[PDB]
Design a protein around this ligand. Structure first.
Ligand code: CU
Ligand code: CU
Ligand code: NA
Ligand code: NA
Lengths: 621, 621
């Protein structure tokens, strides 16, 4: 059995049983995170050791625990009580969905605020908003959620149309107490509805769209074996799924002739955060770590055939644990399919008389998640030519506020009285590299302009420079779009037939990084987001750029701590962490439901192959 | 009849007849350019006036002419003799394809160079390479082409595999004389073949690709009327075709409710140039203005169904003039089709219980051209949400040289002894704007970082700033990817329902601009390419960023001259010229035939609509 197979329902039940028998899962315990661990380095040989990591909350007020279990051997490997004021709180629990609203509904201060606004408490929705770390000393070591009110006029109404500005509250979800209710003043609650299925707002539906049918009469060109092992057009990989990260890719490799050549050992989105840029005290604390605080895999959607994924689709239905250790399937949570991708290569040669055209295609592995108002599609693509790409598709409903009567430098107007605070959506891709194996290095490549003069008398020359990042202290890099900056991951011990090291080049989109002041709480908690590229030496326990327990963790954790080790990364087992994101000034067109916008990155072979790897693609039928 | 209809065969024959009768097209004349002119402003009412512009070369040595004809009235409007030393030479003629090779084959200096290298002259290919303007005084006012040798071992061999470095020659294609033969020394001619249809090099063809079938059982959702008028999913436009520019889009507009709202009056790629960065005197003069010197529409490919354009395709077959004024059809030269484009909008709402997904699609209008070794696909896309995008797909065979034995700062290695000089492919999109009509302005928008302090005590705030470009002297702009710089075209006299000016935002890729020294010939002849964005006041005669006659024109022409007029562009009829390109350090994977790489730009609505314009899209079948 592949050590990279998806977790099965029986493994999760086994973890439950092991924890129970060890005294670690009594009736007061709640599993906040559970996932299989990847195999250790050099473990390929041999014998199963499937281990699971578990974060266990306690509803009675006792300290939570981090536990690793061997499901293979039926044993607890390690169990440690956590001091959450030091190392962070556990991820938000599903069962907290309604707790903030419930607590607030019986609080006299909350009710006073609602009564001033003539709002029916039974119509007021409130979400479990993550709290971060600000100036409130009573919150240190306590599990806090914050709450913002949105009115639902009727049960199928979009509450996002009706934000209640000027009001925020903080609660403790263990003691079930409301710690603070803050009312800065009454803003009109926007009146118009945002019901995008109401014919009054949609108008008559278009009747002009004729069907576009995508079929594969012979079935798909990829195979799936062992549950999650993909073979497609020379590519080989395993599709993992983790409740925190979502879809993970393992063992990305390319079969070049008779050799299986590794490229990336593990690819994931290891963090994603949505920092808000509105200085109103109602929202200035808000930074949603969709991955680290909420767990994006947990909220993966079940994808509808013909709707979410069109064509000949092979689904995976990954299994996760509920809060009690029972397995729960996400039916049709991962789509896998190949897509036509236009022209691959084309040339019409006058001298030879040969006219040549070939088509491209890509393998797609995707999932979609919903976190509150946001919905995101995460797409990995493998192309015939060896290119690897990630794309995020951001949609949903925008997070709303009042639009201030005098206008705003930090909020845009969507509808009468309705605002959208500015924000970013910033991702970190963790790419545990294995270019032709684990001995890798990274070079920063810039274009080099040359001065007109001796050796360049016509002033046309230009060049390139590559700078090796030799130690972690040198490996925190920023974009430079003007100079075409990219980063090449190579294997200095593996040369192509031209005696040049094999490599892959990372092409970033060069979007803005974290805009917050560098002294802010968010700049400290999401330090990764302040720089485009980090390179670390691989270590088993360095998994997330924000650290293991993000919720209410004070600044400092993750990448900035890991690189202090100043380890050798010049021809070693290394990990690239690429920050990329969208900066969103919401437009009227984003209301009442947002069209998709996109961001991502790609890696292209750079002297990895001895010539084009797609010369054996046949002409299209 | 629409004044924007494609030229017909009969119109071209009529132009021929008119020129003949006027004494302007005797047997020594050759048409180097012919195309319909767009209607004048305010001409919509009324009555036909189809005018054609013609550049007429004379093979006997007499001066060429620029002529405008009214095909409607059977008259010559203007005819002027050109002084080519002043205003530039005419575009390269098709009949010059073989002239450089032919001349050189009987030249003793050329033959001496070939004999030293043991090369059979009958196997030596040479192209009509554009000459530019360098230090050779004898070339001023003369029609010159330069020639580089490539060996074809047999008639179906790819000559690009066998460049003959150290050798270049210059000819006069009117006097049929070889002016210079320069031999800097013998380089080995690379030996390996680059025959990408030879089984020895391809290997056995893959048998693993299963069909991907794209069909439309009810036909397409767009209609074509009047030959070239498209109606699709609220969009309206006319598809033009010009021998120089290729596919042009006219009258791009969007039907918002019962109002046809203009967006872009004319969109084209008005120039494209390929500057080379190798300071060897063998190539340091080379800059191929594929559009302005060669005419990309002229070399548009005939596109094969199921191969080049997949799905339900509607073709146009545009007509151009041959060198004698006879019409020539480019059969199946333009593809039009709609494509599925993934998720348009999606949200799963816990509070309302509504789960909503809609799919996106795009209208595609494309052509493919071949210029020597290069092949480019030009794609325009219209999306359901109002986004407009252009994408160029660059492929073909890379232009080769020897790889110097000591390595090179300006050439990369492709195969043993085979090099690829560094170069860029730089496009200029000319967007004659009409956002809700012709009264438009441009603002540069940057993100604004804010300092932690009073009014921003948590250091989270960020903002945006917009600066109006009020006069042409202020409207030559550069990218700033780090600050998320974009440019918004708005109509200051047309407000959306929120009392904000309607607009569209240009999103650039922020790739490097022209790298050459600013004092070089190429920086002066392709000045447009040195800056990302220019805004001019519309004028009928300001068509190309490089001017009308690019071939052998000294530096200065086009945009830098036009903006000296310093015209008012604040709420006026304006034109945006966006420079964008690829910087290519060729990789081993690009040999022997290059996979596609891409560059482009998009424009997204920015408060153009009163809410999302896709709320009336129905759920997918
Ligand atoms: Cu957003
Ligand atoms: Cu190129
Ligand atoms: Na690694
Ligand atoms: Na205009």
């Amino acid at each position: 059995a592949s050590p990279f197979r998806l977790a099965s329902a029986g493994e999760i039940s086994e973890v439950q049983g092991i924890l129970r028998t060890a005294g670690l899962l009594g009736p007061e315990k709640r599993i906040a995170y559970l996932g299989v661990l990847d195999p250790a380095r050099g473990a390929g040989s041999e014998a199963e050791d499937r281990r699971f990591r578990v974060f266990i909350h306690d509803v009675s007020g006792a300290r939570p625990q981090e536990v690793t279990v061997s499901v293979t051997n039926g044993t607890v490997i390690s169990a440690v009580e956590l001091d959450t004021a030091a190392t962070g709180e556990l991820p938000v629990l599903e069962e907290e969905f309604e707790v903030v609203e419930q607590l607030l509904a019986t609080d006299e201060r909350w009710l006073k605020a609602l009564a001033a606004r003539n709002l029916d408490v039974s119509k007021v929705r409130v979400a479990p908003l993550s709290a971060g770390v600000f100036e409130y000393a009573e919150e240190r070591g306590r599990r806090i959620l914050r709450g913002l009110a949105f009115v639902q006029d009727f049960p199928e109404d979009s509450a996002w149309a009706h934000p209640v500005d000027g009001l925020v509250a903080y609660v403790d979800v263990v003691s079930k107490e409301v710690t603070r209710v803050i009312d800065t003043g009454v803003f009109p609650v926007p009146a118009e509805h945002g019901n995008y299925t109401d014919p009054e707002l949609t108008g008559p539906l278009r009747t002009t769209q004729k069907p576009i049918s995508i079929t594969q009469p012979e079935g798909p060109s990829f195979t799936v074996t062992g549950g999650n092992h993909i073979e497609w057009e020379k590519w080989s990989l395993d599709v993992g799924f983790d409740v925190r990260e979502g879809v993970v890719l393992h063992n990305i490799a390319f079969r070049d002739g008779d050799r299986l050549r590794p490229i990336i050992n593990r690819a994931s989105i290891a963090e994603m955060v949505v920092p808000y840029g509105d200085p109103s005290p109602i929202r200035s604390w808000q930074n949603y770590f969709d991955t680290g605080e909420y767990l994006v895999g947990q909220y993966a959607n079940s994808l509808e055939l013909g709707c979410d994924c069109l064509g000949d689709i092979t689904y995976l239905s990954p299994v996760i644990s509920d809060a009690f250790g029972n397995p729960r399937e996400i039916r049709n949570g991962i789509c896998m399919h190949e897509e036509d991708w236009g022209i691959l290569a084309k040339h019409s040669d006058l001298w030879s008389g040969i006219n040549y055209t070939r088509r491209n295609r890509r393998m797609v592995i995707s999932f979609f998640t919903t976190i509150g108002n946001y919905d995101y599609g995460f797409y990995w693509y493998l192309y015939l030519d060896g290119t690897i790409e990630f794309e995020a598709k951001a949609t949903g409903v925008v997070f709303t506020s009042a639009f201030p009567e005098g206008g705003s430098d930090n909020i845009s107007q969507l509808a009468p009285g309705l605002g959208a605070p500015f924000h970013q959506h910033i991702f970190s891709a963790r790419l545990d590299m294995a270019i032709d194996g684990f001995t890798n290095r990274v070079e920063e490549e810039d274009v080099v302009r040359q001065t007109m003069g001796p050796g360049n008398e016509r002033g046309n020359a230009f060049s390139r420079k590559r700078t090796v990042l030799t130690r972690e202290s040198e490996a925190v890099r920023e974009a430079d779009a003007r100079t075409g900056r990219t980063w090449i991951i190579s294997n200095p011990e593996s040369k192509n037939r031209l005696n040049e090291p094999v490599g892959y080049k990372l092409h970033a989109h060069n979007q803005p990084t974290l805009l917050a002041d560098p002294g802010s709480s968010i700049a400290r908690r999401a330090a990764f987001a302040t720089k485009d590229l980090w390179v670390t030496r691989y270590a088993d326990d360095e998994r997330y750029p924000t650290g293991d327990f993000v919720n209410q963790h004070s600044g400092g954790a993750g990448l900035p701590s890991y690189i202090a080790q100043d380890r050798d990364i010049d021809g070693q087992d290394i990990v690239v962490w690429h920050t990329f994101g969208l900066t969103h000034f919401p437009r009227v067109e984003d209301w009442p439901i947002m069209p998709v916008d996109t961001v991502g990155f790609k890696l292209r072979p750079e002297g990895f192959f001895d010539r084009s790897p797609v010369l054996d693609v046949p002409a299209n039928p």
